[PDB]
Amino acid sequence: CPHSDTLTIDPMITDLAGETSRLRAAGPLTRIDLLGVPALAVTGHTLARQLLTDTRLVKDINAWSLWQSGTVTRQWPLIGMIDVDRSMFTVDGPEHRRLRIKTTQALTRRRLDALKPTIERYVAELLDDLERAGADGAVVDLKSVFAYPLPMRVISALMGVPSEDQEQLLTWYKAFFSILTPQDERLRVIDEMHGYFTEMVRRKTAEPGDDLTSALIYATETPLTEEEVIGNLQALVAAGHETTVSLILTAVRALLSHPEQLRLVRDGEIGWETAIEETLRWDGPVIHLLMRFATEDIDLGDAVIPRGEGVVMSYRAIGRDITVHGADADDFDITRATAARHISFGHGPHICPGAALARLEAAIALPALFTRFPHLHPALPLDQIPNLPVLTQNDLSHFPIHLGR
Numbered sequence: 588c589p590h591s592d593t594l595t596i597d598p599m600i601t602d603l604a605g606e607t608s609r610l611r612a613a614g615p616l617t618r619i620d621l622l623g624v625p626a627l628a629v630t631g632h633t634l635a636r637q638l639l640t641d642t643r644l645v646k647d648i649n650a651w652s653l654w655q656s657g658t659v660t661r662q663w664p665l666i667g668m669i670d671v672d673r674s675m676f677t678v679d680g681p682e683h684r685r686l687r688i689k690t691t692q693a694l695t696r697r698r699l700d701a702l703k704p705t706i707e708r709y710v711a712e713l714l715d716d717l718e719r720a721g722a723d724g725a726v727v728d729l730k731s732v733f734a735y736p737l738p739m740r741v742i743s744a745l746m747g748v749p750s751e752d753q754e755q756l757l758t759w760y761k762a763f764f765s766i767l768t769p770q771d772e773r774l775r776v777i778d779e780m781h782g783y784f785t786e787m788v789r790r791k792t793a794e795p796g797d798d799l800t801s802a803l804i805y806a807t808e809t810p811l812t813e814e815e816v817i818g819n820l821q822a823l824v825a826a827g828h829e830t831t832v833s834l835i836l837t838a839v840r841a842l843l844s845h846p847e848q849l850r851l852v853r854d855g856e857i858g859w860e861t862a863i864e865e866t867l868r869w870d871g872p873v874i875h876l877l878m879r880f881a882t883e884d885i886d887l888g889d890a891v892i893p894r895g896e897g898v899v900m901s902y903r904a905i906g907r908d909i910t911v912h913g914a915d916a917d918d919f920d921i922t923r924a925t926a927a928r929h930i931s932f933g934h935g936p937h938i939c940p941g942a943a944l945a946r947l948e949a950a951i952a953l954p955a956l957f958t959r960f961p962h963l964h965p966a967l968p969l970d971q972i973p974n975l976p977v978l979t980q981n982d983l984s985h986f987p988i989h990l991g992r
């Protein structure tokens with residue numbers, strides 16, 4: 588591929604390793620092309636930290652010059668990632684905290700202790716499904732049987748999504764994230780999702796229960812608008828499911844391909860927690876985060892982000908930052924000193940509110956899985972597991988394993 592001064596993000600994810608390296612090498616700020624739409628990617632750790640706390644970078648899609656001019660529209664296949672309703676996700680400034688506070692309180696380590704038994708129950712249930720599927724030495728998909736359902740069950744328990752509605756949510760999410768979904772069908776799926784959660788908030792308003800959705804509705808003043816409640820709810824369920832599936836799967840893939848490091852955690856010399864942090868740094872759930880806009884020109888010394896320009900946080904490239912992590916940043920090493928120094932959960936006001944929950948689900952699921960099936964191994968070379976065509980998320984397709992004897 589000849590030299591180009593715009594890096595085109597391939598939506599088929601045919602060369603993630605190469606693209607990620609190009610992005611680091613072109614950085615820490617470089618021009619990218621997202622399905623025919625230009626933007627700047629932040630690929631460097633220190634610069635990312637700076638800009639994530641910069642008040643001249645906002646989520647508001649109306650601050651985007653290409654949106655103002657109608658150059659980008661709802662026909663853009665990535666538009667569902669950013670042209671969404673009011674929530675903690677889209678708001679900046681003094682109003683932002685109000686939209687976050689009930690959620691961060693509900694998701695503190697101490698509050699999550701109450702959720703621990705529930706997580707344990709689902710993990711045990713799905714390991715049981717794994718046993719059944721892997722009987723008589725059969726090949727089994729670790730994603731569909733285990734990693735894919737677990738975080739949906741867990742986030743659904745927290746928010747009050749009924750057992751019987753969870754399959755439909757997963758079907759919608761799959762359509763929503765796949766670049767291949769026809770755009771008209773995707774926009775219809777976006778409407779259906781919104782319709783589902785509108786009704787859920789109406790149901791919880793009539794009949795509140797012991798769940799975060801009910802706590803968002805009834806605080807602990809001033810009360811959240813209906814739109815705000817629905818917006819927070821959609822963001823929490825989608826993010827809580829999609830990111831966490833990836834982290835479970837990549838952590839297993841990492842440890843299975845680095846058996847000496849798997850041994851370290853199994854024998855209690857390094858914490859599972861630490862293996863999870865290194866996974867987040869090295870092969871984490873987010874590839875790119877769309878998208879922020881300059882309210883005015885931002886001067887970075889030898890470079891200017893012009894007012895109205897789109898800014899993407901390229902979190903995977905940032906995790907491979909050689910300046911911060913040393914020359915071997917492209918290796919998985921749970922013993923490295925900077926394993927916990929990533930910003931894969933973000934930085935600043937929009938930092939992930941669910942990081943503790945994510946960490947807890949992984950810290951329960953991973954040891955449970957390897958203790959239950961100590962001889963678990965790939966039935967297909969790990970390096971041949973392809974990514975699903977989902978541009979922004981590190982979404983693995985399937986994960987064939989044998990339980991082992």
Ligand code: HEM
Pocket residue numbers: 675676677687742822823824826827828830831834871872873876900902930931932933934936937938939940941942944945946
């Ligand atoms: C498990 C792995 C996870 C990773 C790698 C992850 C990563 C992130 C990152 C990087 C952001 C901020 C993007 C930015 O502003 O630049 C974020 C925001 C958010 N995340 Fe997490 N997340 C994870 C799990 C979760 C979970 C479990 C939940 C909910 C329970 C969640 C809910 C949210 C919400 C609602 C936001 C928007 C916050 C705001 O904009 O103020 N994510 N996620």
Ligand SMILES: CC(=O)[C@H]1CC[C@H]2[C@@H]3CC=C4C[C@@H](O)CC[C@]4(C)[C@H]3CC[C@]12C
Pocket residue numbers: 667668669671676780821822823825826829830872873876980
């Ligand atoms: C970083 C990440 O992967 C998560 C954190 C916040 C999440 C977004 C928060 C809210 C929404 C709206 C929802 O209807 C569609 C998914 C979408 C657009 C999420 C996509 C995945 C995101 C971006």
Ligand SMILES: [K+]
Pocket residue numbers: 670671672
């Ligand atoms: K909208």
Ligand SMILES: [Mg+2]
Pocket residue numbers: 590591592
């Ligand atoms: Mg050039």
